[PDB]
Structure 1
Amino acid sequence: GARASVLSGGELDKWEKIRLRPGGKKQYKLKHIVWASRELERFAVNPGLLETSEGCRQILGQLQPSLQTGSEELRSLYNTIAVLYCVHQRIDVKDTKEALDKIEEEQNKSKKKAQQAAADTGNNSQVSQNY
């Protein structure tokens, strides 16, 4: 029926190791995986995505633009969803601050690719018309 598997044996060890903040005094715990699970379903997002390398990539997409005007809750999410994500992408980090950059820089490339051809506005061009 319902199969639960967020962090396997290996992901578990690394998880407990990773910290929420760079200059904090506490590491990651299940409390963060569950807390985000109950908060996800609230945003019309099933908690099953937390155990999917693809889901995280999506969940972060909605929080990315939200970070601008997000609250304490919205922030904590991007943090957890960030670490858990890197774990599913065969990525290794020490804290959330680092993992976050890995997710931001990874997307920065997509922008350069989807914003390289549309950057030559200047002299008048040619085009048909019927006026």
Structure 2
Amino acid sequence: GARASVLSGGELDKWEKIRLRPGGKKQYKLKHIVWASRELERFAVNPGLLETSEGCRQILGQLQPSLQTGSEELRSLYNTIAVLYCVHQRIDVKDTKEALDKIEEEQNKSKKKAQQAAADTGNNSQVSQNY
């Protein structure tokens, strides 16, 4: 590492604007970018990924399925990494939840075109009614 750079001038302005929660009274700050950095390296994940539109995405992939059995720490992570990610994907949000909706909407479409072979294990079919 020579010159670290997570959020540029533009990303900074928007970052400070974005909130951690939809129904809160606090916005985002460097405190969250640095904090998540320390917790990241702890999970064998370098903080340099936070400044990468690609890394931020992967980090959410491992936390996604972890959210089911994750603690307060995992929450703040998936929440922060979610906002920072959208920032690198030319995405604009107002809160953390908002970003999640976008990341989930973009994935929901890339769910059927991801397997096309391993999506026939269970059993589920559409509904049929009259009129």
Give the secondary structure class of the aligned counterpart of 1:111: coil
TM-score (norm 2): 0.87
Task: From the CA coordinates, give the structure whose radius of gyration is larger.
Answer: 1
Q: Deviations over 1:33-60 (max 9, x none)?
A: 0000000000000000000000001000
Q: Deviations over 1:83-122 (max 9, x none)?
A: 0000000000100111011111111112111345666799
Q: Mark the CA change 1:65 to 1:130 in structure 2 (over 3 Å): closer, same or farther.
A: same
Runs (5+) with no aligned partner, structure 1: none
Q: Mark the CA change 1:45 to 1:123 in structure 2 (over 3 Å): closer, same or farther.
A: closer
CA RMSD of aligned residues (A): 7.7
Give structure 1 regions of 4+ aligned residues with deviation exceeding 4 angstroms: 115-131
Larger deviation, residues 52-61 vs 117-126: 117-126
CA distance in 1, matches of 2:8, 2:120: 48
TM-score (norm 1): 0.87
Runs (5+) with no aligned partner, structure 2: none
Q: Mark the CA change 1:124 to 1:65 in structure 2 (over 3 Å): closer, same or farther.
A: closer
Aligned to 2:120: 120
Larger deviation, residues 99-108 vs 24-33: 99-108
Query: May I ask how many residue pairs the two structures share in their alignment?
Result: 131
